[PDB]
Tab-separated table of N, CA, C and O in Angstrom:
chain	number	residue	atom	x	y	z
A	1	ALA	N	69.761	151.678	100.730
A	1	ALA	CA	69.005	152.875	101.677
A	1	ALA	C	67.579	152.071	102.027
A	1	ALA	O	66.715	151.864	101.089
A	2	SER	N	67.334	152.365	103.234
A	2	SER	CA	66.284	151.677	103.761
A	2	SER	C	65.378	152.745	104.265
A	2	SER	O	64.335	153.038	105.166
A	3	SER	N	65.045	153.646	102.774
A	3	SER	CA	64.250	154.700	103.217
A	3	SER	C	63.488	155.350	101.496
A	3	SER	O	62.679	154.668	101.481
A	4	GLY	N	64.026	155.998	101.074
A	4	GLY	CA	63.561	156.750	99.857
A	4	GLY	C	64.525	157.802	99.592
A	4	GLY	O	63.723	158.929	99.425
A	5	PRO	N	65.648	157.970	99.113
A	5	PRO	CA	66.640	159.385	98.881
A	5	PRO	C	66.055	159.281	97.392
A	5	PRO	O	64.841	159.435	97.102
A	6	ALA	N	66.949	160.076	96.741
A	6	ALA	CA	66.488	160.773	95.498
A	6	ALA	C	66.692	159.966	94.738
A	6	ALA	O	66.473	159.110	94.626
A	7	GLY	N	66.968	160.115	93.017
A	7	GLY	CA	66.942	159.581	92.284
A	7	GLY	C	67.211	160.295	90.814
A	7	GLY	O	66.608	160.093	89.495
A	8	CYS	N	68.039	160.956	90.982
A	8	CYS	CA	68.433	162.488	89.735
A	8	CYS	C	69.183	161.281	88.756
A	8	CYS	O	69.062	160.200	88.216
A	9	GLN	N	69.594	162.060	87.918
A	9	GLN	CA	70.573	161.623	86.557
A	9	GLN	C	71.293	162.408	85.841
A	9	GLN	O	71.167	163.710	86.403
A	10	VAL	N	72.033	161.968	85.527
A	10	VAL	CA	72.942	162.831	84.414
A	10	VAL	C	73.692	162.293	83.581
A	10	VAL	O	73.255	160.896	83.016
A	11	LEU	N	73.318	162.770	82.070
A	11	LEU	CA	73.672	162.642	80.867
A	11	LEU	C	75.114	163.192	80.396
A	11	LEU	O	75.540	163.876	81.209
A	12	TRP	N	75.626	162.339	79.392
A	12	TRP	CA	76.976	162.398	79.324
A	12	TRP	C	77.306	163.074	77.700
A	12	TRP	O	76.578	162.704	76.629
A	13	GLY	N	77.733	163.728	77.340
A	13	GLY	CA	78.322	164.435	76.248
A	13	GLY	C	80.099	164.291	75.869
A	13	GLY	O	80.758	165.342	76.620
A	14	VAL	N	80.046	163.585	75.559
A	14	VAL	CA	81.457	163.040	75.223
A	14	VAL	C	81.981	163.723	74.178
A	14	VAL	O	81.135	163.864	73.321
A	15	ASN	N	83.406	163.684	73.692
A	15	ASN	CA	83.952	164.570	73.109
A	15	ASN	C	85.379	164.550	72.839
A	15	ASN	O	86.131	165.009	73.573
A	16	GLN	N	85.847	163.420	72.275
A	16	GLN	CA	87.511	162.284	72.145
A	16	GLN	C	88.103	162.996	71.028
A	16	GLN	O	87.471	162.886	69.669
A	17	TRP	N	88.863	163.927	71.540
A	17	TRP	CA	89.956	164.046	70.094
A	17	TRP	C	91.275	163.620	70.167
A	17	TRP	O	91.765	163.204	71.237
A	18	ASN	N	91.513	162.680	69.124
A	18	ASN	CA	93.387	162.526	69.434
A	18	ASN	C	93.068	161.616	70.309
A	18	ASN	O	92.096	159.841	70.055
A	19	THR	N	93.197	161.811	71.623
A	19	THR	CA	93.152	161.489	72.708
A	19	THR	C	93.267	162.137	73.918
A	19	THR	O	94.146	163.031	74.546
A	20	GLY	N	91.815	162.557	74.526
A	20	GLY	CA	91.209	163.085	75.824
A	20	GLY	C	89.922	163.379	75.285
A	20	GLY	O	89.385	164.207	74.696
A	21	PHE	N	89.129	162.387	76.331
A	21	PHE	CA	87.862	162.677	75.716
A	21	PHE	C	87.103	163.691	77.057
A	21	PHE	O	87.383	163.179	78.269
A	22	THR	N	86.481	164.793	76.614
A	22	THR	CA	85.987	165.438	77.357
A	22	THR	C	84.379	165.250	77.764
A	22	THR	O	83.827	165.568	76.835
A	23	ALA	N	84.102	164.653	78.847
A	23	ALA	CA	82.778	164.626	79.156
A	23	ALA	C	81.948	165.835	79.682
A	23	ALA	O	82.455	166.394	80.491
A	24	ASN	N	81.024	166.156	78.890
A	24	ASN	CA	80.305	167.210	79.228
A	24	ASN	C	78.701	166.734	79.714
A	24	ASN	O	78.354	166.150	79.091
A	25	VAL	N	79.062	166.386	80.998
A	25	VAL	CA	78.065	166.098	81.890
A	25	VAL	C	76.696	167.158	82.607
A	25	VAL	O	77.169	168.416	82.409
A	26	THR	N	75.675	166.739	82.255
A	26	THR	CA	74.725	167.503	82.589
A	26	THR	C	73.461	166.741	83.590
A	26	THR	O	72.923	165.858	83.611
A	27	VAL	N	73.953	167.355	84.956
A	27	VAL	CA	72.799	166.826	85.767
A	27	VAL	C	71.502	167.006	86.081
A	27	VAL	O	70.926	167.980	85.665
A	28	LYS	N	70.771	166.452	86.276
A	28	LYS	CA	69.116	166.527	86.437
A	28	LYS	C	68.521	165.820	87.587
A	28	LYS	O	68.662	164.811	88.011
A	29	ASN	N	68.191	166.817	88.173
A	29	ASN	CA	67.109	166.241	89.904
A	29	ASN	C	66.110	166.614	89.441
A	29	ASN	O	65.991	167.543	89.421
A	30	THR	N	65.668	165.539	89.771
A	30	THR	CA	64.092	165.658	90.161
A	30	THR	C	63.163	165.345	91.303
A	30	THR	O	62.133	165.166	91.585
A	31	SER	N	64.057	164.452	92.142
A	31	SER	CA	63.706	164.170	93.157
A	31	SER	C	62.690	164.975	94.418
A	31	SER	O	61.285	164.932	93.809
A	32	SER	N	63.091	165.894	94.661
A	32	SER	CA	62.475	166.726	95.293
A	32	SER	C	62.991	167.817	96.497
A	32	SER	O	63.094	167.651	97.740
A	33	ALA	N	64.072	168.207	96.070
A	33	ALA	CA	64.759	169.386	97.454
A	33	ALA	C	65.811	170.431	96.357
A	33	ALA	O	66.043	170.171	95.297
A	34	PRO	N	65.957	171.166	97.280
A	34	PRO	CA	66.466	172.697	96.630
A	34	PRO	C	67.956	172.535	96.750
A	34	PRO	O	68.850	172.343	97.550
A	35	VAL	N	68.112	171.944	95.502
A	35	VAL	CA	69.635	171.583	95.168
A	35	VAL	C	70.880	172.951	95.187
A	35	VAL	O	70.754	173.038	94.145
A	36	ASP	N	71.150	173.092	95.926
A	36	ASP	CA	72.066	173.997	96.720
A	36	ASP	C	74.185	173.387	96.277
A	36	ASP	O	74.780	173.946	97.341
A	37	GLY	N	73.996	172.958	95.702
A	37	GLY	CA	75.669	172.132	95.649
A	37	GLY	C	74.942	170.937	96.260
A	37	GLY	O	74.476	170.549	96.715
A	38	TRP	N	76.410	169.993	95.214
A	38	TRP	CA	75.976	168.498	96.170
A	38	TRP	C	77.678	168.035	95.670
A	38	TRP	O	78.617	168.384	95.175
A	39	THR	N	77.388	166.806	96.258
A	39	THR	CA	78.620	165.747	95.944
A	39	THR	C	78.205	164.457	95.533
A	39	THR	O	77.884	163.576	96.432
A	40	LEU	N	78.399	164.156	94.019
A	40	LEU	CA	78.347	162.715	93.642
A	40	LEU	C	79.145	161.981	93.844
A	40	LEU	O	80.086	162.390	93.732
A	41	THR	N	78.853	160.413	93.215
A	41	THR	CA	80.084	159.918	93.452
A	41	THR	C	79.750	158.338	92.902
A	41	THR	O	78.828	157.764	92.042
A	42	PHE	N	80.943	157.931	92.164
A	42	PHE	CA	80.630	156.446	91.539
A	42	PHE	C	82.348	155.755	91.503
A	42	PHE	O	83.366	156.151	92.057
A	43	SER	N	82.618	155.539	89.762
A	43	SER	CA	83.798	155.057	89.725
A	43	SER	C	83.934	154.971	88.317
A	43	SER	O	83.022	154.309	87.172
A	44	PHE	N	85.164	155.242	87.639
A	44	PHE	CA	85.651	154.968	86.208
A	44	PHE	C	85.797	153.791	85.828
A	44	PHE	O	86.603	153.112	86.593
A	45	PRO	N	84.923	152.886	84.850
A	45	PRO	CA	84.631	151.762	84.467
A	45	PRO	C	86.516	151.569	83.700
A	45	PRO	O	87.527	150.743	84.242
A	46	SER	N	86.286	152.168	82.794
A	46	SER	CA	87.439	151.705	82.106
A	46	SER	C	88.886	152.430	82.927
A	46	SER	O	88.997	152.485	84.107
A	47	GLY	N	89.642	153.264	82.281
A	47	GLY	CA	90.821	153.750	82.701
A	47	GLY	C	90.696	155.607	82.240
A	47	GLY	O	91.786	156.035	81.754
A	48	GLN	N	89.159	156.001	82.757
A	48	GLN	CA	89.312	157.550	82.578
A	48	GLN	C	90.397	158.432	83.198
A	48	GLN	O	89.619	158.642	84.134
A	49	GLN	N	91.351	158.837	82.675
A	49	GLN	CA	92.156	158.998	83.103
A	49	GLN	C	91.725	160.987	83.527
A	49	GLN	O	91.829	161.651	82.653
A	50	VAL	N	90.551	161.191	83.931
A	50	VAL	CA	90.429	162.773	84.119
A	50	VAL	C	91.358	163.397	84.853
A	50	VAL	O	91.883	163.172	86.009
A	51	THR	N	91.404	164.648	84.589
A	51	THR	CA	92.427	165.581	84.929
A	51	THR	C	91.734	167.118	85.110
A	51	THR	O	91.509	167.779	85.977
A	52	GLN	N	91.812	167.264	83.856
A	52	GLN	CA	91.167	169.219	83.680
A	52	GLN	C	89.600	169.069	84.301
A	52	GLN	O	88.970	168.130	84.254
A	53	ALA	N	89.082	169.940	84.933
A	53	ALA	CA	87.573	170.164	85.288
A	53	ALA	C	87.105	171.149	85.318
A	53	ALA	O	88.037	172.411	85.684
A	54	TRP	N	86.198	171.562	85.558
A	54	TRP	CA	85.245	173.066	85.327
A	54	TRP	C	83.807	172.826	85.902
A	54	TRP	O	82.944	172.136	85.643
A	55	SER	N	83.340	174.151	86.650
A	55	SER	CA	82.274	173.586	87.307
A	55	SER	C	81.996	172.309	88.037
A	55	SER	O	80.536	171.978	88.017
A	56	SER	N	82.777	171.939	88.410
A	56	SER	CA	82.707	170.815	89.433
A	56	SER	C	83.970	170.400	89.556
A	56	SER	O	85.271	170.275	89.676
A	57	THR	N	83.944	170.356	91.310
A	57	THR	CA	85.187	169.973	92.012
A	57	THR	C	85.576	168.239	92.268
A	57	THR	O	85.255	167.299	93.048
A	58	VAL	N	86.000	167.884	90.932
A	58	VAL	CA	86.235	166.504	90.440
A	58	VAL	C	87.154	165.932	91.234
A	58	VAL	O	88.095	166.325	91.804
A	59	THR	N	87.093	164.613	91.706
A	59	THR	CA	88.183	163.861	92.569
A	59	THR	C	88.053	162.570	92.360
A	59	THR	O	87.644	161.654	92.457
A	60	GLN	N	89.434	162.191	91.434
A	60	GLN	CA	89.615	160.561	90.966
A	60	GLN	C	90.318	159.610	92.180
A	60	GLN	O	91.533	160.298	92.726
A	61	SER	N	89.638	158.985	93.240
A	61	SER	CA	90.168	158.569	94.204
A	61	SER	C	90.534	157.274	93.647
A	61	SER	O	90.404	155.852	93.652
A	62	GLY	N	91.909	157.572	93.180
A	62	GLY	CA	92.555	155.623	92.568
A	62	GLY	C	92.061	155.371	91.109
A	62	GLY	O	92.526	155.647	90.458
A	63	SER	N	91.179	155.276	91.438
A	63	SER	CA	90.226	154.559	89.793
A	63	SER	C	88.682	155.065	90.354
A	63	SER	O	88.135	155.236	89.295
A	64	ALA	N	88.198	155.393	90.780
A	64	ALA	CA	87.185	156.022	91.214
A	64	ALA	C	86.608	156.744	91.344
A	64	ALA	O	87.731	158.412	90.961
A	65	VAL	N	85.399	157.613	91.065
A	65	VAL	CA	85.496	159.382	91.124
A	65	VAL	C	84.668	159.695	91.812
A	65	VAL	O	83.594	159.390	92.944
A	66	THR	N	84.595	160.885	91.890
A	66	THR	CA	83.582	162.035	93.109
A	66	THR	C	83.689	163.494	92.683
A	66	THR	O	84.544	163.680	92.231
A	67	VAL	N	82.319	164.178	92.883
A	67	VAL	CA	82.514	165.532	92.322
A	67	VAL	C	81.547	166.406	92.930
A	67	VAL	O	80.328	166.224	93.358
A	68	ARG	N	82.248	167.355	93.863
A	68	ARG	CA	81.915	168.240	94.612
A	68	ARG	C	81.258	169.580	93.538
A	68	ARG	O	82.178	170.250	93.631
A	69	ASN	N	80.229	169.748	93.220
A	69	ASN	CA	80.068	170.775	92.607
A	69	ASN	C	79.750	172.116	93.140
A	69	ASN	O	78.732	171.905	94.091
A	70	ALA	N	80.363	172.921	93.222
A	70	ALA	CA	80.430	173.908	93.522
A	70	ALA	C	78.722	174.556	94.105
A	70	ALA	O	78.059	173.942	93.395
A	71	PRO	N	78.556	175.440	94.980
A	71	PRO	CA	77.331	176.156	95.449
A	71	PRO	C	76.291	176.417	94.209
A	71	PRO	O	75.466	176.780	94.141
A	72	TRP	N	77.139	177.813	93.423
A	72	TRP	CA	76.940	178.559	92.702
A	72	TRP	C	76.571	177.576	91.331
A	72	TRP	O	75.643	177.723	91.231
A	73	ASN	N	77.212	176.761	90.556
A	73	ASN	CA	77.191	176.390	89.614
A	73	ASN	C	76.268	175.017	89.989
A	73	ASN	O	75.593	174.147	89.103
A	74	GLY	N	76.129	174.801	91.130
A	74	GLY	CA	74.954	173.814	91.902
A	74	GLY	C	73.883	174.314	92.564
A	74	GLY	O	73.094	173.872	93.499
A	75	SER	N	73.171	175.469	92.099
A	75	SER	CA	71.892	176.043	92.635
A	75	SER	C	70.782	175.803	91.504
A	75	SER	O	70.142	176.793	91.218
A	76	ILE	N	70.482	174.227	91.541
A	76	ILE	CA	69.401	173.805	90.562
A	76	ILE	C	68.101	173.264	91.718
A	76	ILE	O	68.477	172.526	92.770
A	77	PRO	N	66.946	173.917	91.610
A	77	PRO	CA	65.643	173.584	92.000
A	77	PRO	C	65.735	172.143	91.941
A	77	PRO	O	65.591	171.737	91.026
A	78	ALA	N	65.061	171.547	93.091
A	78	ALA	CA	64.360	170.007	92.925
A	78	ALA	C	64.165	169.780	91.685
A	78	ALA	O	64.758	168.523	91.158
A	79	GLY	N	63.720	170.481	90.457
A	79	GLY	CA	62.909	170.289	89.297
A	79	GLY	C	63.714	170.822	88.556
A	79	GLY	O	63.671	172.080	87.629
A	80	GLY	N	65.270	170.572	88.196
A	80	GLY	CA	65.716	171.137	87.347
A	80	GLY	C	67.031	170.808	86.786
A	80	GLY	O	67.426	169.830	87.522
A	81	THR	N	68.194	171.465	86.561
A	81	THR	CA	69.370	170.657	85.800
A	81	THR	C	70.927	171.599	86.450
A	81	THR	O	70.826	172.589	86.472
A	82	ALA	N	71.819	170.700	86.290
A	82	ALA	CA	72.977	171.478	86.534
A	82	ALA	C	74.038	171.086	85.653
A	82	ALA	O	73.717	170.552	84.782
A	83	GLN	N	75.244	171.764	85.410
A	83	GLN	CA	76.082	171.151	84.597
A	83	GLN	C	77.552	170.961	84.938
A	83	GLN	O	78.053	172.350	85.057
A	84	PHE	N	78.606	170.366	84.333
A	84	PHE	CA	80.130	170.159	84.713
A	84	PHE	C	80.425	169.572	83.563
A	84	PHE	O	80.085	169.013	82.660
A	85	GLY	N	81.947	169.672	83.456
A	85	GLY	CA	82.760	168.450	82.339
A	85	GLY	C	84.267	168.539	82.711
A	85	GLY	O	84.545	169.386	83.534
A	86	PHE	N	84.757	167.940	82.545
A	86	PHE	CA	86.191	167.793	82.378
A	86	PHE	C	87.141	166.761	81.075
A	86	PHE	O	86.147	166.596	80.612
A	87	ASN	N	88.471	166.925	81.338
A	87	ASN	CA	89.384	166.321	79.970
A	87	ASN	C	89.692	164.931	80.745
A	87	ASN	O	91.035	165.503	81.506
A	88	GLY	N	89.646	163.979	80.165
A	88	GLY	CA	90.757	162.926	80.536
A	88	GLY	C	91.158	161.772	79.435
A	88	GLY	O	90.410	161.801	78.209
A	89	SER	N	92.102	161.508	80.006
A	89	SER	CA	92.559	160.664	78.613
A	89	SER	C	92.041	158.901	78.864
A	89	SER	O	92.318	158.508	79.787
A	90	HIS	N	91.551	158.428	77.537
A	90	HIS	CA	91.231	157.271	77.542
A	90	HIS	C	92.060	156.148	76.718
A	90	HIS	O	93.009	156.329	76.790
A	91	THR	N	91.502	155.507	76.554
A	91	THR	CA	92.517	153.890	75.828
A	91	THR	C	91.490	153.252	74.747
A	91	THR	O	91.701	152.365	73.647
A	92	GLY	N	89.937	153.401	74.545
A	92	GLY	CA	88.509	153.371	73.799
A	92	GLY	C	88.097	151.702	74.712
A	92	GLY	O	88.218	150.723	74.284
A	93	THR	N	87.341	152.748	75.514
A	93	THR	CA	86.595	151.636	76.282
A	93	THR	C	85.311	152.417	77.098
A	93	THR	O	84.900	153.584	76.857
A	94	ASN	N	84.982	151.527	77.746
A	94	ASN	CA	83.633	152.049	78.490
A	94	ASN	C	83.870	152.945	79.680
A	94	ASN	O	84.869	153.472	80.470
A	95	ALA	N	83.336	154.132	79.237
A	95	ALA	CA	83.746	155.703	80.147
A	95	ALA	C	82.447	155.684	81.110
A	95	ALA	O	83.167	156.247	82.437
A	96	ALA	N	81.302	155.689	80.983
A	96	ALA	CA	80.530	156.468	81.445
A	96	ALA	C	79.627	155.269	82.105
A	96	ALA	O	78.917	154.637	81.465
A	97	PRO	N	79.620	154.796	83.520
A	97	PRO	CA	78.765	153.484	84.211
A	97	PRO	C	77.394	153.657	83.852
A	97	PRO	O	76.869	154.151	82.610
A	98	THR	N	76.910	153.392	84.843
A	98	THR	CA	74.747	153.556	84.796
A	98	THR	C	74.416	154.127	85.774
A	98	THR	O	74.392	155.434	85.399
A	99	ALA	N	74.244	153.884	87.202
A	99	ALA	CA	73.466	154.816	87.849
A	99	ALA	C	74.588	155.250	88.902
A	99	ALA	O	74.841	154.469	89.860
A	100	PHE	N	74.955	156.499	88.868
A	100	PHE	CA	75.911	157.099	90.216
A	100	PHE	C	74.992	157.143	91.114
A	100	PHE	O	74.521	156.326	91.439
A	101	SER	N	75.704	158.103	91.939
A	101	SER	CA	75.105	158.096	92.727
A	101	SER	C	75.275	159.992	93.807
A	101	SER	O	76.814	160.195	94.372
A	102	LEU	N	74.387	160.392	93.718
A	102	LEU	CA	74.432	161.783	94.630
A	102	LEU	C	74.855	161.954	95.734
A	102	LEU	O	75.492	160.989	96.266
A	103	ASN	N	75.084	162.884	96.566
A	103	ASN	CA	75.617	162.828	98.231
A	103	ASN	C	74.351	162.431	98.814
A	103	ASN	O	74.000	162.651	99.378
A	104	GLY	N	74.704	161.202	98.768
A	104	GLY	CA	73.777	160.161	99.431
A	104	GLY	C	72.816	159.528	99.031
A	104	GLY	O	71.523	159.140	99.376
A	105	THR	N	72.516	159.767	97.306
A	105	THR	CA	71.417	159.033	96.779
A	105	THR	C	71.572	158.375	95.294
A	105	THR	O	72.510	159.012	94.998
A	106	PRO	N	71.029	157.674	94.810
A	106	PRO	CA	71.413	157.032	93.521
A	106	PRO	C	71.127	157.897	92.531
A	106	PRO	O	70.600	159.415	92.567
A	107	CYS	N	71.547	157.898	90.995
A	107	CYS	CA	70.987	158.838	90.136
A	107	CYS	C	71.440	157.924	88.773
A	107	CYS	O	72.648	157.826	88.384
A	108	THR	N	70.502	157.575	87.966
A	108	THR	CA	70.632	157.107	86.242
A	108	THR	C	71.300	157.981	85.444
A	108	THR	O	70.670	159.120	85.427
A	109	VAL	N	71.976	157.594	84.826
A	109	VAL	CA	72.489	158.242	83.561
A	109	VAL	C	71.796	158.242	82.884
A	109	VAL	O	70.376	158.625	82.874
A	110	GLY	N	72.213	159.688	81.727
A	110	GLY	CA	70.984	159.960	80.449
A	110	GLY	C	71.592	159.953	79.551
A	110	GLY	O	71.776	160.876	78.804
């Protein structure tokens, strides 16, 4: 980025039962813009086979990931937060990386 995009962040709220880690994520934008829906992306380190999702149009590309959070559940102002989650099967390893990237901007986990 040869300019100065955003730099939001997202926290993780894992909840693994037997096998199926349900990640309760909460987006946090603070850069400076009316977030009326968005599309972040990064990749699952281990084999987080995500499948069930809500309040987020998740999409696993082979092994990577992307989430297009709807406009309604994505109506958070520059200094606000959003939230979504899903249920994926794990194996006991790294689940959430570090700084993912909103639709065109980085985002440090929380």
